[PDB]
Design an enzyme around this catalytic site. Structure first.
Site, PDB file in Angstrom:
ATOM      1  N   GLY A   1       0.699  -1.476   0.265  1.00 37.94           N
ATOM      2  CA  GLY A   1       0.043  -0.163  -0.182  1.00 37.94           C
ATOM      3  C   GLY A   1       0.919   1.218  -0.449  1.00 37.94           C
TER       4      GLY A   1
ATOM      5  N   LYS B   1       7.827  -0.122   1.399  1.00 40.74           N
ATOM      6  CA  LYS B   1       7.737  -0.894   0.249  1.00 40.74           C
ATOM      7  C   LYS B   1       9.682  -0.620  -0.231  1.00 40.74           C
ATOM      8  CE  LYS B   1       5.068   0.994  -3.313  1.00 40.74           C
ATOM      9  NZ  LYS B   1       4.319   1.546  -2.724  1.00 40.74           N
ATOM     10  N   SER B   2       9.879   0.579  -0.285  1.00 40.87           N
ATOM     11  CA  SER B   2      10.773   1.377  -0.643  1.00 40.87           C
ATOM     12  C   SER B   2      12.146   1.447  -0.219  1.00 40.87           C
ATOM     13  CB  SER B   2      10.548   2.844  -1.135  1.00 40.87           C
ATOM     14  OG  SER B   2       9.776   3.378  -1.579  1.00 40.87           O
TER      15      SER B   2
ATOM     16  N   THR C   1      10.370   6.525 -12.952  1.00 43.96           N
ATOM     17  CA  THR C   1       9.310   6.794 -13.486  1.00 43.96           C
ATOM     18  C   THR C   1       8.677   8.342 -13.398  1.00 43.96           C
ATOM     19  OG1 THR C   1       8.136   5.453 -11.841  1.00 43.96           O
ATOM     20  CG2 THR C   1       9.433   4.223 -13.918  1.00 43.96           C
ATOM     21  N   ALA C   2       9.200   8.408 -12.467  1.00 40.90           N
ATOM     22  CA  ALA C   2       8.387  10.349 -11.871  1.00 40.90           C
ATOM     23  C   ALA C   2       8.922  10.899 -11.679  1.00 40.90           C
ATOM     24  CB  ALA C   2       8.527   9.720 -10.122  1.00 40.90           C
TER      25      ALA C   2
ATOM     26  N   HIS D   1      14.163  12.658   0.506  1.00 40.07           N
ATOM     27  CA  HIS D   1      14.373  10.783   0.555  1.00 40.07           C
ATOM     28  C   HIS D   1      15.544  10.672  -0.761  1.00 40.07           C
ATOM     29  CE1 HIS D   1      10.238  10.911   2.561  1.00 40.07           C
ATOM     30  NE2 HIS D   1      11.086  11.037   3.621  1.00 40.07           N
TER      31      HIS D   1
ATOM     32  N   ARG E   1      20.056   8.397  -0.122  1.00 38.98           N
ATOM     33  CA  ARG E   1      20.635   7.888  -0.921  1.00 38.98           C
ATOM     34  C   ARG E   1      21.830   7.851  -1.093  1.00 38.98           C
ATOM     35  NH1 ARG E   1      19.807   8.545  -5.122  1.00 38.98           N
ATOM     36  NH2 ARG E   1      17.830   9.385  -5.941  1.00 38.98           N
TER      37      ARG E   1
END
Ligand code: B12
Ligand code: B12
Ligand code: B12
Ligand SMILES: C[C@H]1O[C@@H](n2cnc3c(N)ncnc32)[C@H](O)[C@@H]1O
Ligand SMILES: C[C@H]1O[C@@H](n2cnc3c(N)ncnc32)[C@H](O)[C@@H]1O
Ligand SMILES: C[C@H]1O[C@@H](n2cnc3c(N)ncnc32)[C@H](O)[C@@H]1O
Lengths: 179, 178, 179
Positions: free
Chosen positions: A11, A16-17, A36-37, A51, A55
């Site tokens: 959800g 999940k990321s 994709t964003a 965010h 990384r």
């Protein structure tokens, strides 16, 4: 059993990321975020700038807003692990452009089973609420469910993430009942 | 480990139909779709015509838009496996027609526990979204949740389907904590 | 292993409450329901009147509409099992007031990891539908998601309740893939 493809479903704000990133980073492979964003509103511009700043320098980023399958063919190889940040946003770009969604969803499942090197797909579940009251939301809900069916089939492993905790649903034998 | 009754729950386009159809064909019994709605718009007309083309001559069709419980009691016998196409569309028929939903839900769960032959119920999860903004949708959300709970208690086995993949959740010991 | 803290997650009308109540009543410690909910409509009032007639007089109520971390540190003792009605309604009360949610969520995670007594949090999943039409609902989807993650980390046990049936997802070995 090194796997060559993993699908992570959950959800919104499911974890999940973070889970995807953790598998990618413990692989000792050369890491590429397939993006994709496109932040086109303030809400979305936050999430990318903020965010991304958490990384490592170790990640490389390649954009693929429409030609996701083509990019995977070209960029996949045994030294590299590709991560697709959102199948959800890719499908949304196609839907809003007026493409028919069956052939490219079909191309993506083919590409995933025939991939040079390993890939992690991250995708949303959008199917467990009340039926949307508009043709657009309904048409997306079908493409998202079909697409997650065709990826889950094509991929070697599949994991479902609920409240930041991961649960493998593949590999694993499906139940079979005796009437 | 033999059973009479299976509930398959999942989201929209989760693969729950495919899965019910596979367990149905795996049994070798004579096969009946219990259809719970006809299609009254173009989109629905299509979804019910690809379903028609993907079922070979082993399959029979009985409609029960409203008297699902009664229909299950008449048609359920040991030579047969019945598949209830969509519990969700049945509840939708009752809700819109203005029926009180508790008695017919309780009567389906009672009927499921006591059937002469085996049955697979196919149903949607609809309770994992944002609280809907209208009384009609909130009532459906309450009623589909109770119905999925009472069938799940009644039925021998319960499977949850995500992204075309089934997970058994009954039978199986439920968690306990000190 | 005897546990400190359980998170119970699931959708609307899934059997979260009944499951939480069963475990609470099998523990034979003193039972406090930490209510977070003001019945300000007919539907909401009937929901909490059908709950309160299904509880032997073994249960004592306590209201915590806003200051839920504080209330948990002040009422928790090994002599007592505490059950918060709805994390979801508590979050909602804060969102509507205009509070910034990050601090109060992180505070609650902290408190759950360091309790004087056992507590069960009952919490909704709201992440599995289509994106909401409006910012209020989007803001809530992300906060309820973040909150379930942090409470899952902080709690010793996590259960997931579907159609009235509890699956334990923690403790348990998170799957690890290698590529
Ligand atoms: C049954 C049904 C409902 C159910 C909900 C079922 C559910 N899953 O949530 C209930 C009774 C709640 C319902 C309510 C409404 N829905 Co209705 N109904 C449907 C229908 C026929 C099937 C959806 C469904 O059950 N899942 C499909 C399952 C069986 O497939 P699956 O992959 O196995 O999952 C749809 C779809 C259609 N015919 O196109 C509409 C449909 C979505 N509903 C529609 C309408 C009009 C509504 C209501 C606004 C009714 C109203 N006039 O007040 C509300 C909106 C609720 C909301 N979104 O907030 C319209 C949408 C029109 C539009 N696109 O502009 C549809 C398309 C039907 C139609 N009239 O043509 N509905
Ligand atoms: C908390 C709450 C919210 C929360 C979300 C809760 C959730 N589950 O997603 C937030 C603040 C996000 C919210 C938002 C809104 N909701 Co509100 N609120 C509620 C309330 C009181 C509790 C619902 C709940 O959380 N139940 C889930 C748990 C506790 O239940 P369980 O799983 O069975 O346990 C509801 C329901 C109700 N009957 O009042 C309304 C209610 C659904 N909300 C309402 C409204 C008006 C809204 C908003 C439109 C407010 C706004 N102006 O933007 C928005 C939009 C909702 C949407 N679907 O887009 C109205 C809907 C009115 C109607 N039917 O005509 C309700 C009925 C409150 C009321 N008495 O008027 N809401
Ligand atoms: C992709 C997307 C969609 C997708 C569905 C995505 C989904 N269900 O997850 C589709 C194309 C179906 C869609 C449709 C619409 N959405 Co849209 N879109 C988005 C976007 C960009 C993505 C969020 C997301 O999908 N997942 C995020 C993933 C990667 O991460 P995670 O889920 O946390 O994990 C959002 C959000 C945003 N703030 O930009 C809007 C956004 C939510 N959408 C918006 C709009 C307006 C719509 C539509 C009304 C479009 C239309 N004109 O019909 C419909 C309504 C959907 C509904 N019924 O609720 C607006 C809502 C504006 C508002 N007032 O709140 C947003 C905020 C974009 C904008 N700034 O204009 N959308
Ligand atoms: C869902 C709605 O959101 C808008 N939209 C589409 N893609 C994006 C994006 N990446 N970021 C922000 N808004 C977007 C469009 O206006 C679309 O209609
Ligand atoms: C949700 C809305 O969908 C319509 N409706 C109800 N049942 C069906 C069906 N089987 N097919 C198509 N539309 C239907 C009605 O207009 C109802 O109010
Ligand atoms: C989502 C909407 O619900 C209303 N609201 C807030 N809390 C409650 C409650 N306990 N009961 C009923 N309605 C409530 C508010 O008006 C808010 O805007």
């Amino acid at each position: 059993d090194p796997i060559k493809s993993l699908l992570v479903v959950g959800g919104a704000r499911s974890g999940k990321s973070r889970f995807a990133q953790r598998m990618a980073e413990a692989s000792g492979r050369s890491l590429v975020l397939i993006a994709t964003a496109q932040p086109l509103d303030a809400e979305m511009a936050d999430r990318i700038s903020r965010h991304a700043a958490d990384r490592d320098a170790r990640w490389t980023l390649i954009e693929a807003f429409f030609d996701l399958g083509q990019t995977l063919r070209r960029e996949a190889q045994p030294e590299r692990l590709l991560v697709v940040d959102s199948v959800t946003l890719w499908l949304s770009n196609l839907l809003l452009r007026g493409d028919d969604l069956s052939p490219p969803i079909k191309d993506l499942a083919r590409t995933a089973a025939r991939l040079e090197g390993p890939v992690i797909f991250v995708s949303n579940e959008v199917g467990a609420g009340i039926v949307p009251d508009n043709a657009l939301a309904r048409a997306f809900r079908d493409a998202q469910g079909m697409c997650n069916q065709r990826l889950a089939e094509a991929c070697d492993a599949v994991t479902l993430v609920t409240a930041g905790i991961a649960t493998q649903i593949k590999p694993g034998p499906e139940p079979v009942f005796r009437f």
